[PDB]
Amino acid sequence: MFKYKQVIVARADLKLSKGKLAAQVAHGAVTAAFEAYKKKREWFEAWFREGQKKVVVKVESEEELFKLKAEAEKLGLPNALIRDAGLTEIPPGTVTVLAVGPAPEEIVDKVTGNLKLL
Amino acid sequence: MFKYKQVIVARADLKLSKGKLAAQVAHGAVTAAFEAYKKKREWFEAWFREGQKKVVVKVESEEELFKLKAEAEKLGLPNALIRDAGLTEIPPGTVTVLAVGPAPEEIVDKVTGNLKLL
Ligand SMILES: [Zn+2]
Ligand SMILES: [Zn+2]
User: Fold this and answer.
1) Which residue, among B42, B69, B53, has the nearest Cα to A20 in the 3D structure?
2) Which residues in A22-108 belong to E strands, given as ranges?
3) Is there a smaller number of Cβ atoms within 10 Å at the N or the C end of chain B?
4) For residue B81, what are the β-bridge partners?
5) Structural domain harbouring A32
6) DSSP of A95-113, one letter per residue?
7) Which positions 80-109 of A are in contact with B (Cβ < 8 Å)?
8) Cis bond leading into A92, ω under 30°?
9) Can you tell me where the transmembrane regions are (chains A, B)?
């Protein structure tokens, strides 16, 4: 089993194409990965050598993303709430995804454990 | 404007679900972003500063990913060819995507320029 993982929560309600959604998830993964690299170096390295497991789940609102981000901050988890200015097709400042981790899988689940796969 | 970008080339012939595609694209983006961070810090920082633009394009064969990887290596561009072990849904060692960049957009296109958006 993978002891470490990064879960990216994506807003399915925005109905982004498979491609643009993938790009948004990537923004989240990269940003949160570097957050971990800087603030939780050991978690990052362990995750990386293990195969940097990632799981993509979904939610249907920005409200849900903000709530989950607050939970992640409370736990001290590396995370990244994404807003893409290059995404002019949606309102400015619109949040697209929330990446949680890398971190020990159990702690990431403490946040996203009740979310469904996308 | 975006002077830098990262292009993630995904195999459309694998017919990956929306969620697994995003996960694979993320693996590529993260691995390639760290390659840039370590080997082309300046390109990484500019990219990150501009909003780390990412574009997901496609190819219809496994050979195309390797041909593109060779070109990216020849040009000294940060890149990452992904093979997801955890993705036991497909043959072991099957390549899913190739992330190219971050780097100046024109040089990234020198590799992926003729590929269609996914
Ligand atoms: Zn090579
Ligand atoms: Zn160009």
Assistant:
1) B53
2) 54-59, 79-83, 95-104
3) N
4) B98
5) 1-118
6) EEEEEEEEEEHHHHHHHHT
7) 84-86
8) no
9) none
Instruction: Read off the tokens for B19.
Output: 């969620």
Q: Taking the alpha carbons of A70, A73, A74, A75 in that order, is the dihedral positive or negative?
A: positive
**How many domains does one find in chain B?**
1
Owner of token pair 């500019």: B46
Residue B40 touches chain A, beta carbons under 8 Å: no
Distance CA B90, CA B115 (A): 24
SS3 assignment, position B16? coil
Q: Which CATH number covers residue B24?
A: 3.40.1490.10
> What are A72's two structure tokens?
């992640």
Residue A70 CA, chain-centre distance (Å), reads: 13
Half-sphere exposure of A75 (CA within 13 A, CB side): 21
- What technique was this entry resolved by? X-ray
Contacts of A31 in chain B (CB under 8 A): 52
